[PDB]
Design a protein around this ligand. Structure first.
Ligand SMILES: COc1ccc(-c2c(-c3cc(-c4cncc5ccccc45)c(O)cc3O)noc2NC(=O)C2CC2)cc1
Length: 208
């Protein structure tokens, strides 16, 4: 287990998201679905010239998995997946400018829902989650677990859990007052309202 500090700007953005009173929290789901869609686009495109890249799984889709017992909402995709360098360095590097621009926009009146326009929508997860754990697997690389409860640091480790074929699994450990996002009807509403134009199947797993 290695522990890292977030880039300064990103840590500041996370603090703002966590501490600003903002009722329209449902936007987190659209942003995570959008990220999955981008990752799916990437593996789809790469497979067009190298179909062996789908040996780790041909289906390109997104599953939404609420679990009231664990108080978790899981967003799983079979996209390209992330490398160790993605988790430690690249995600942060490619987000820096958008983060700075988003922070400036906020100070100048813009509202939190604009976050996705700046390419940093992931961090809206912290509107509803006290901790986010992400398992990811890129071809020809190992499975990793990323995790953060904010507060300025994240961890990365090699994951010895159940093998994913390829893709990314975002596990939102929800805040006690945010359990509405574990309800079937609510998730359906949110997906229809914000994520109706995604080129991959989105499947809601109903709890038994
Ligand atoms: C918007 O920018 C990005 C950056 C990277 C990705 C991405 C994901 C992915 C990432 C996040 C996510 C996005 N942002 C921060 C995250 C932080 C921790 C864990 C997942 C994160 C996620 O929620 C779901 C995913 O399937 N998987 O592979 C990817 N590779 C790329 O796309 C190559 C740069 C081309 C998606 C969007």
């Amino acid at each position: 287990v290695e522990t890292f500090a977030f880039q300064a700007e990103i840590a500041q953005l996370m603090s703002l998201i966590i501490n600003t009173f903002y009722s329209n929290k449902e936007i987190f789901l659209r942003e995570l679905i959008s990220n999955s869609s981008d990752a799916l686009d990437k593996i789809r495109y790469e497979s067009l010239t190298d179909p062996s890249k789908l040996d780790s799984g041909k289906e390109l889709h997104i599953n939404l998995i609420p679990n009231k017992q664990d108080r978790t909402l899981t967003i799983v995709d079979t996209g390209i997946g992330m490398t160790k360098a993605d988790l430690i360095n690249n995600l942060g590097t490619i987000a820096k400018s958008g983060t700075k621009a988003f922070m400036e926009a906020l100070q100048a009146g813009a509202d939190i829902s604009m976050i996705g326009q700046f390419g940093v929508g992931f961090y809206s997860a912290y509107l509803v989650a006290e901790k986010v754990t992400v398992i990811t697997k890129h071809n020809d690389d190992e499975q990793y677990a990323w995790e953060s409860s904010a507060g300025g640091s994240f961890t990365v480790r090699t994951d010895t859990g159940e093998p994913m074929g390829r893709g990314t699994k975002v596990i939102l450990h929800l805040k006690e007052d945010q359990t509405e996002y574990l309800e079937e009807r609510r998730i359906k509403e949110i997906v229809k309202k914000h994520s109706q134009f995604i080129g991959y199947p989105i499947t809601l797993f109903v709890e038994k």
